[PDB]
Amino acid sequence: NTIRVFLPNKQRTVVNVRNGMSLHDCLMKALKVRGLQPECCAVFRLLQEHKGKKARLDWNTDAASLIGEELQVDFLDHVPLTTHNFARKTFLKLAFCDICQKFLLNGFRCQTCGYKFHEHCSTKVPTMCVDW
Amino acid sequence: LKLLDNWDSVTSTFSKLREQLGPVTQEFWDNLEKETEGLRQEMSKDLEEVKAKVQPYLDDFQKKWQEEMELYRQKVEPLRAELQEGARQKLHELQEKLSPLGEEMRDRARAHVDALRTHLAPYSDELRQRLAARLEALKENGGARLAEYHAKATEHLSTLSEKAKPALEDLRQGLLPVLESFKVSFLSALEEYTKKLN
Amino acid sequence: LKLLDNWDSVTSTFSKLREQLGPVTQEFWDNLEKETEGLRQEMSKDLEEVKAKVQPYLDDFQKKWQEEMELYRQKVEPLRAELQEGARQKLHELQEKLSPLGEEMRDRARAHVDALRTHLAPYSDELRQRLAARLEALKENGGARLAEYHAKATEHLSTLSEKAKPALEDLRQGLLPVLESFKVSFLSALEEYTKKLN
Amino acid sequence: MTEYKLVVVGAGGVGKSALTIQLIQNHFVDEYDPTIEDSYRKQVVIDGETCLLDILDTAGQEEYSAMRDQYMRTGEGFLCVFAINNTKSFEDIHHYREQIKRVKDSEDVPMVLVGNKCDLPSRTVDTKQAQDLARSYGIPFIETSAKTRQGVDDAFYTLVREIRKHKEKMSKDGKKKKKKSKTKC
Numbered sequence: 001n002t003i004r005v006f007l008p009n010k011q012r013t014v015v016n017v018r019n020g021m022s023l024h025d026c027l028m029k030a031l032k033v034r035g036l037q038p039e040c041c042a043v044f045r046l047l048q049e050h051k052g053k054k055a056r057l058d059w060n061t062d063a064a065s066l067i068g069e070e071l072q073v074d075f076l077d078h079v080p081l082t083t084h085n086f087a088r089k090t091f092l093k094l095a096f097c098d099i100c101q102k103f104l105l106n107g108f109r110c111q112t113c114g115y116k117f118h119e120h121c122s123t124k125v126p127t128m129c130v131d132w
Numbered sequence: 133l134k135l136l137d138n139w140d141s142v143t144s145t146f147s148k149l150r151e152q153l154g155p156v157t158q159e160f161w162d163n164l165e166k167e168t169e170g171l172r173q174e175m176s177k178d179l180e181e182v183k184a185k186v187q188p189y190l191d192d193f194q195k196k197w198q199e200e201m202e203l204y205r206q207k208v209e210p211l212r213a214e215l216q217e218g219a220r221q222k223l224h225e226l227q228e229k230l231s232p233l234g235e236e237m238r239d240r241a242r243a244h245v246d247a248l249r250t251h252l253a254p255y256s257d258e259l260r261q262r263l264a265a266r267l268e269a270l271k272e273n274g275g276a277r278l279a280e281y282h283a284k285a286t287e288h289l290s291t292l293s294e295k296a297k298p299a300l301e302d303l304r305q306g307l308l309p310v311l312e313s314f315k316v317s318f319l320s321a322l323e324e325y326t327k328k329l330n
Numbered sequence: 331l332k333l334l335d336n337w338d339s340v341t342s343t344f345s346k347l348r349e350q351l352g353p354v355t356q357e358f359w360d361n362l363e364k365e366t367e368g369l370r371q372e373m374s375k376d377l378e379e380v381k382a383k384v385q386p387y388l389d390d391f392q393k394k395w396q397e398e399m400e401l402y403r404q405k406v407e408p409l410r411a412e413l414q415e416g417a418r419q420k421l422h423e424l425q426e427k428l429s430p431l432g433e434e435m436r437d438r439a440r441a442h443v444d445a446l447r448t449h450l451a452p453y454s455d456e457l458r459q460r461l462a463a464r465l466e467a468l469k470e471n472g473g474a475r476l477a478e479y480h481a482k483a484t485e486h487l488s489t490l491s492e493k494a495k496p497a498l499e500d501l502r503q504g505l506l507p508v509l510e511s512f513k514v515s516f517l518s519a520l521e522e523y524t525k526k527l528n
Numbered sequence: 529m530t531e532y533k534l535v536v537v538g539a540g541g542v543g544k545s546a547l548t549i550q551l552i553q554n555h556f557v558d559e560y561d562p563t564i565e566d567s568y569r570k571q572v573v574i575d576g577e578t579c580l581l582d583i584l585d586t587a588g589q590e591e592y593s594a595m596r597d598q599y600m601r602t603g604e605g606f607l608c609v610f611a612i613n614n615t616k617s618f619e620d621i622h623h624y625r626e627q628i629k630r631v632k633d634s635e636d637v638p639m640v641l642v643g644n645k646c647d648l649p650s651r652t653v654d655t656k657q658a659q660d661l662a663r664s665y666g667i668p669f670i671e672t673s674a675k676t677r678q679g680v681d682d683a684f685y686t687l688v689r690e691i692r693k694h695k696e697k698m699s700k701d702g703k704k705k706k707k708k709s710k711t712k713c
C-alpha cells in the first residue's frame with residue numbers, strides 16, 4: 001500500500017500507510033518536518049479527465065483508496081501554484097546573467113526558483129523560472 | 133459529452149494499435165535478429181580481419197613513423213644548431229642597434245618631450261586662463277539663464293495650475309459620468325459572457 | 331458624445347500654450363542672444379588663440395615629425411637592410427630544409443600512400459563483399475518488411491475505415507445539432523451585443 | 529543551470545533521511561519514519577553557477593524492487609551512508625555497492641562512503657577500518673552525524689567532485705582496460 005504524496009514546487013514523499021490513515025493523518029507527519037500550516041493548504045487528487053483543474057478532496061479521505069495515485073497539496077488560499085518571488089540580494093559568488101551577456105552584481109533572485117538576472121532582466125524574460 | 137464520445141474512439145484506436153503492436157514488434161524484432169545476427173556473422177570479418185590486418189598495417193605505419201621520427205631527430209639537431217647560430221647573429225645585429233639607436237631614441241625622446249614640455253608650460257596656463265574666462269562667462273550668463281529659467285519654470289508652473297486645477301477638475305467631472313456609463317456596459321457585458329459562455 | 335466638452339479643455343491648453351510660447355520665445359531669443367554673444371566672446375579669443383597656438387603647435391609637431399622621420403631613415407632603413415639580410419639567411423636556411431626534407435616529406439607521403447594503396451584499397455574490396463552481404467540482408471529483410479508494411483497498411487486501412495465510418499457519422503450527427511445550438515448562441519450573442527454597442 | 533543527480537542508499541536506521549532534512553530543510557527529527565520515495569530540490573549557486581541538486585532518497589527497509597532498479601539507474605552520484613554505531617550497516621555497504629554496480633552496468637561509479645553518527649560514544653566501527661577498506665576500493669570516506677551536522681555540507685559536495693572527475697576520467701579513458709587511471713585537469 002503505497003501512496004504518492006506530492007508537495008508544492010516538485011517535492012515528493014511516498015510514505016507507508018496501514019490500518020487506516022486519512023489524508024490529514026499523513027500530512028500531520030510532513031507538517032512537523034516542513035514546519036508550515038495546513039490552513040493555506042488544500043488537498044487535490046490526480047487529474048481525472050480534465051482540461052486543467054485540480055479536483056479537491058477531503059481531509060478524512062483514506063490514503064489507502066488512493067494507492068498508486070498522486071496526491072498533491074497546493075496553496076489554494078488566494079493564488080495557487082508556486083509563483084516567482086522578487087527579492088534583491090547579493091549572490092554567493094560572481095556569476096553570469098541568464099538573460100544578458102554580463103556579470104550579475106546586484107539584481108533580483110527568486111526563493112522558490114532561484115534564477116539569476118539583473119534588474120532590467122526582471123521583465124526582459126517572458127519565461128518563468130519554474131522547472132519540471 | 134463530446135469529449136467522452138470522441139475519447140471512446142481514441143481508446144479503440146489505442147487498443148487496435150496495441151493489438152497490432154504485438155505482431156509488429158515480433159516482426160520487427162524478427163528482421164532485427166537477422167540484422168543483428170548478420171552483423172554478428174560479419175563481426176568475424178569486419179572486426180576479426182581488422183584486428184588481424186591491423187597488425188601489419190600498424191606495424192608498417194609505426195615503423196615508418198619511427199623512421200620519420202628518427203629522421204626528424206637527426207634533422208632537429210643540426211637545424212636547431214643552425215637556428216641557434218643564426219639567432220645568435222640575428223639577435224646580435226638587433227642588439228648592435230638596440231644600444232646606439234636605443235640610446236639615441238631615448239635622448240631623442242627626451243627632446244621630443246622637452247619640446248612639448250616647453251610648449252605645454254605656457255599652453256597649460258593659457259588653457260586655465262581660457263577655462264577661467266569661459267567659466268566666468270558661463271557663470272554670469274549662467275546666472276542670468278538660471279534666473280530666467282526659474283522665472284519661465286514659475287510661469288509654466290502657474291499655467292500648470294490651470295491643468296492641475298481647472299483641467300483636472302474638468303477631466304474628473306468628465307470621467308465621473310463616463311465611468312458610470314462604462315460600468316453599465318461593462319456589467320452588461322459580464323452578463324453576456326455568463327449567458328453565452330455558460 | 332461628450333467629446334465636445336473635452337475638446338474645449340484641449341483647446342484651452344493649446345491657447346494657454348500659445349500665450350506661453352509668445353513671451354517665452356521673446357525672452358528665449360534674448361536668452362539665445364546672451365548665449366550666442368557670450369559664447370562668441372569666448373570663441374573670439376578661442377579662435378584667435380587657436381591660430382596663435384596651432385601655428386607653433388604645428389611647428390613643434392613638424393619638428394617632431396621631421397625628427398622621427400630622420401630617425402626612421404637612420405633606424406628603419408638600416409634595420410630593413412639587416413632585416414632583408416636576416417630574411418635572406420632564413421630563406422637560405424629554409425631552402426636548405428625545403429629541399430632535402432621537402433623531397434623527404436614527399437617520399438614519406440609516397441610511403442604512406444603506397445601503404446594506403448595496399449591498406450585501404452584492398453580493404454575496400456573486402457568491404458565491398460561485406461557491404462554486399464549487409465545490403466543483401468537489408469534487401470532480404472527489406473523484402474520481408476515490404477510485405478509487413480503492405481500487410482500492416484491493409485490492417486491499418488481496415489481499422490481506419492472501421493473507425494472512420496462510425497466516427498464521421500457520429501461527428502456529422504453530433505455537429506448537426508451542435509451547429510444548430512451554435513446558431514442559437516451566435517444569434518443571441520449578436521443581438522445582445524448590438525444593443526450593448528448601440 | 530547545472531544539474532546533478534544524487535541518489536542516496538543505506539540500511540534502515542542509518543540516518544539517511546535525517547541528513548537530508550537537517551541539510552536542505554535544516555530540521556531535526558526524532559521519531560523513526562520509514563522513507564519510501566522522497567526527493568529534495570534546491571537551486572544553489574556553487575562557485576557562482578546555478579546548480580540544481582536532484583536528491584533522491586530510498587527505502588532502507590526493503591529487499592528488491594523493480595521500480596528501484598529503474599530510478600536508481602538514472603542516478604550519477606551515490607552516497608553510501610551507514611552508521612558507525614552499528615556493524616550491520618558496515619557489512620551492508622558491500623551489498624549496496626554490488627547492487628549499484630549491476631544497475632549502473634559499471635565497476636567504477638561515483639560513490640562516497642559516509643560514516644554517520646560518528647559523534648556518538650557508541651563507536652563500533654573505527655575510522656581506520658572504513659578508510660582502509662575504502663582506500664582499497666578507490667572510494668573516499670567522510671565521517672558525519674545528523675546530530676552534530678558537522679561535515680554534512682561538504683559531504684554532499686564531495687560527491688559532486690567525484691562526479692565531475694568521473695566524467696572527465698571517462699573522456700580520457702573511453703571505458704578501456706587501462707592500468708593507469710590517474711588524471712585530473
Ligand SMILES: CCCCCCCC/C=C\CCCCCCCC(=O)OC[C@H](COP(=O)(O)OCC[N+](C)(C)C)OC(=O)CCCCCCC/C=C\CCCCCCCC
Nearest residue numbers: 044045046047050051052053054055072074079080081130
Ligand atoms: C481565452 C478564453 C478561453 C479560450 C479557450 C481555451 C484556450 C486555452 C488556451 C490556453 C490555456 C491557458 C491557461 C492554462 C491554465 C492551466 C491551469 C492548470 O494548471 O491546468 C493543470 C495543469 C497540470 O497541473 P495541475 O492540473 O495539477 O495544476 C492545476 C493548477 N491550476 C488549477 C491553476 C488549474 O497545469 C500545469 O500543467 C502547469 C503548466 C501549464 C499547464 C497549462 C495547461 C493548459 C491546458 C490547456 C491549454 C491548451 C488547450 C489546447 C490543447 C491542444 C493540444 C493539441
Ligand SMILES: CCCCCCCC/C=C\CCCCCCCC(=O)OC[C@H](COP(=O)(O)OCC[N+](C)(C)C)OC(=O)CCCCCCC/C=C\CCCCCCCC
Nearest residue numbers: 051052053054074078079080081082083084126127128130
Ligand atoms: C496547443 C498548445 C498551444 C500553446 C500556445 C497557445 C497560444 C495562444 C495564443 C496566445 C497566447 C500565447 C501565449 C500563451 C502562454 C501560455 C502560458 C501557459 O501555458 O500557462 C499555463 C498555466 C497553467 O497553470 P499554472 O498553475 O501552471 O499557471 C498559473 C499562472 N498564474 C499564476 C496566472 C495564474 O496557466 C496560466 O499560466 C494562466 C495564464 C498565466 C499568464 C497570464 C498573463 C496575463 C497577461 C497577458 C496575457 C497575454 C496573452 C496573449 C495576448 C495576445 C494578444 C494579441
Ligand SMILES: CCCCCCCC/C=C\CCCCCCCC(=O)OC[C@H](COP(=O)(O)OCC[N+](C)(C)C)OC(=O)CCCCCCC/C=C\CCCCCCCC
Nearest residue numbers: 095096097098099100101102103104124125126127529577
Ligand atoms: C525565448 C523564446 C524562445 C527562444 C528559442 C531559441 C533560443 C532563445 C534563446 C537564446 C537565443 C540564442 C540565439 C543564438 C545565439 C546564442 C546561442 C546560445 O546557445 O548561447 C548559449 C550557449 C550555451 O551557453 P554557454 O555556456 O556555451 O555560454 C556561456 C557564455 N559565458 C562564458 C558567459 C557565460 O553558448 C554556446 O553554446 C557557445 C559555447 C558552446 C559552443 C558549442 C559548439 C558545438 C559545435 C558543434 C557541436 C554540435 C552538436 C549538435 C548536437 C548537440 C546535442 C546536445
Ligand SMILES: CCCCCCCC/C=C\CCCCCCCC(=O)OC[C@H](COP(=O)(O)OCC[N+](C)(C)C)OC(=O)CCCCCCC/C=C\CCCCCCCC
Nearest residue numbers: 096097098099100101102123124125126127529530577578
Ligand atoms: C541581418 C540582421 C543582423 C542584426 C544584428 C543585430 C541583432 C542580432 C540579433 C541578436 C543578437 C544575438 C547575439 C548573441 C546573443 C547570445 C545570447 C546567449 O548566448 O545566451 C546564452 C544563455 C546561456 O544560458 P545557459 O548556458 O546557462 O543555459 C543553457 C543555454 N543553452 C540551452 C544554450 C543550453 O542563454 C540565454 O541567454 C537565453 C535565456 C533565455 C532568453 C529568453 C529571451 C526571450 C525573449 C525573446 C526571445 C527572442 C528569440 C529570438 C530568436 C531568434 C532566432 C533567429
Ligand SMILES: CCCCCCCC/C=C\CCCCCCCC(=O)OC[C@H](COP(=O)(O)OCC[N+](C)(C)C)OC(=O)CCCCCCC/C=C\CCCCCCCC
Nearest residue numbers: 093094095096097098099100101102103104105575576577
Ligand atoms: C550607445 C552607448 C553604448 C554603451 C555601451 C553598450 C555596450 C557595448 C559597448 C562596448 C562594447 C564592449 C562592452 C564590454 C562590456 C564588458 C562588461 C564586463 O565587465 O563584463 C564582465 C563580466 C564578468 O567578468 P569576467 O567574466 O570578464 O571575469 C570572470 C572572472 N575572471 C576574469 C577570472 C575572468 O564578463 C563579461 O561580461 C563577459 C561577456 C562576454 C560576452 C559579451 C557579449 C557582448 C555583446 C555585444 C557586444 C556589445 C554590443 C553593444 C551594442 C550597443 C547598441 C546601442
Ligand SMILES: CCCCCCCC/C=C\CCCCCCCC(=O)OC[C@H](COP(=O)(O)OCC[N+](C)(C)C)OC(=O)CCCCCCC/C=C\CCCCCCCC
Nearest residue numbers: 097098099115116125126127128129130131132529530578
Ligand atoms: C509581443 C509578442 C507577444 C509576447 C507575449 C509574452 C511573451 C511570450 C509569452 C510567453 C513566453 C513563451 C516563451 C517560449 C520560449 C521559452 C524559451 C526559454 O526557455 O527561455 C528560457 C530558457 C532557460 O534555459 P535554462 O537552461 O536556464 O533553463 C531550462 C529550464 N527548462 C527545463 C525546463 C527548459 O532559455 C534557454 O534555455 C536558452 C536557449 C538558447 C537557445 C539558443 C539556440 C540558438 C540556435 C540558433 C541561433 C542562431 C542565431 C544566428 C544569428 C542571429 C540570432 C538572432
Ligand SMILES: CCCCCCCC/C=C\CCCCCCCC(=O)OC[C@H](COP(=O)(O)OCC[N+](C)(C)C)OC(=O)CCCCCCC/C=C\CCCCCCCC
Nearest residue numbers: 126127128129130131132529530531532569579580581582
Ligand atoms: C532530446 C534531444 C533531441 C535532440 C535532437 C537533435 C537536435 C538537438 C538540439 C539540441 C540539443 C538539445 C538537448 C536538450 C537536452 C535536455 C532536454 C530536456 O531538458 O528535457 C527536459 C526538459 C524539462 O526538464 P525539467 O524542467 O525537469 O528540468 C530538468 C533539469 N533541471 C533540474 C534543470 C531543470 O524539457 C524542457 O525543458 C522543455 C521546455 C520546458 C519549459 C517549462 C517552462 C515553460 C515556461 C513557460 C511556458 C510558456 C509557453 C508560451 C506558449 C508556448 C506555445 C508553444
Ligand SMILES: CCCCCCCC/C=C\CCCCCCCC(=O)OC[C@H](COP(=O)(O)OCC[N+](C)(C)C)OC(=O)CCCCCCC/C=C\CCCCCCCC
Nearest residue numbers: 278279280281282283284285286287288289290291292350
Ligand atoms: C517634468 C518635466 C517638464 C519639462 C518642461 C517644464 C520645465 C519647467 C522648468 C524646469 C523643469 C525642471 C525639471 C527637472 C526634472 C528632474 C527630474 C529628476 O532628476 O528626477 C530624479 C529622480 C531620481 O530618482 P528618485 O529620487 O525619484 O528615486 C530615488 C530612490 N532611492 C532613494 C532609492 C534613491 O528621478 C525622478 O525624479 C523621476 C522623474 C520622472 C519624471 C517623469 C515625467 C513624465 C512626464 C512626461 C513623459 C513624456 C515626456 C515627453 C512628452 C512628449 C509629448 C509630445
Ligand SMILES: CCCCCCCC/C=C\CCCCCCCC(=O)OC[C@H](COP(=O)(O)OCC[N+](C)(C)C)OC(=O)CCCCCCC/C=C\CCCCCCCC
Nearest residue numbers: 603604605691692693694695696697698699700701702703
Ligand atoms: C543539431 C541537429 C543534430 C542532428 C543529429 C546530428 C548532430 C551532429 C552534430 C554533432 C555531433 C553530436 C554527436 C553526439 C554524440 C553523442 C554525445 C552524447 O550522447 O554524450 C552523452 C553524455 C552522457 O553523459 P556522460 O556522463 O557520459 O558525459 C558527460 C560529459 N562528458 C562527455 C564529456 C563526460 O553527455 C556528454 O557526453 C556531454 C555532452 C557532450 C557529448 C559529446 C559527445 C561527442 C561524441 C562524438 C562526437 C561526434 C563524433 C562523430 C562526428 C561525425 C561528424 C560527421
Ligand SMILES: CCCCCCCC/C=C\CCCCCCCC(=O)OC[C@H](COP(=O)(O)OCC[N+](C)(C)C)OC(=O)CCCCCCC/C=C\CCCCCCCC
Nearest residue numbers: 175177178179180181182183696699700701702704706711
Ligand atoms: C572494422 C573497422 C571499424 C572502424 C571504426 C571507425 C570509427 C571508430 C569509432 C570509435 C573508436 C575510437 C577508438 C579510439 C582509440 C584511441 C582512444 C584514445 O586513447 O584517444 C586518446 C586521445 C588523446 O587523449 P588525451 O589527450 O586525453 O590523452 C593522451 C595520452 N597520451 C599522450 C598517451 C597522448 O583522445 C582521442 O583520441 C579522442 C578522439 C575523439 C574525440 C571526440 C571529441 C568529441 C567532442 C565533441 C564532439 C563535437 C562534434 C561537432 C560536430 C559538428 C562539427 C562542425
Ligand SMILES: CCCCCCCC/C=C\CCCCCCCC(=O)OC[C@H](COP(=O)(O)OC[C@H](N)C(=O)O)OC(=O)CCCCCCC/C=C\CCCCCCCC
Nearest residue numbers: 321324331516517518519520521522523524525526527528
Ligand atoms: C456586429 C458586431 C457585434 C459585436 C462583435 C464583438 C466582437 C468583434 C470582434 C470581431 C468582429 C470584427 C472582425 C473584423 C475582421 C476584419 C478583417 C479584415 O478586414 O482584415 C483586413 C482589414 C482591411 O482594412 P481596410 O480595408 O481599411 O484596410 C485595407 C488596407 N488599407 C489595404 O487594403 O492595404 O483590416 C482592417 O480593417 C483593420 C483596420 C480597420 C480600420 C477601420 C476600423 C473601423 C472600425 C469601425 C468603424 C467605425 C465604427 C464607429 C462606431 C460604430 C458603432 C457605434
Ligand SMILES: Nc1nc2c(ncn2[C@@H]2O[C@H](COP(=O)(O)OP(=O)(O)NP(=O)(O)O)[C@@H](O)[C@H]2O)c(=O)[nH]1
Nearest residue numbers: 541542543544545546558562563588645673674675
Ligand atoms: N544522534 C544521531 N541521530 C541520528 C543521526 N542520524 C540519524 N539520526 C536519527 O535516527 C532517527 C531516524 O533517522 P532516519 O534518517 O529516518 O533513518 P533512516 O536510516 O534514513 N531511515 P530511512 O532510510 O527509512 O528513512 C532520527 O531520530 C534521526 O534524527 C546521527 O548522525 N546522530
Ligand SMILES: [Zn+2]
Nearest residue numbers: 097100118121
Ligand atoms: Zn541580465
Ligand SMILES: [Zn+2]
Nearest residue numbers: 084110113129
Ligand atoms: Zn524565479
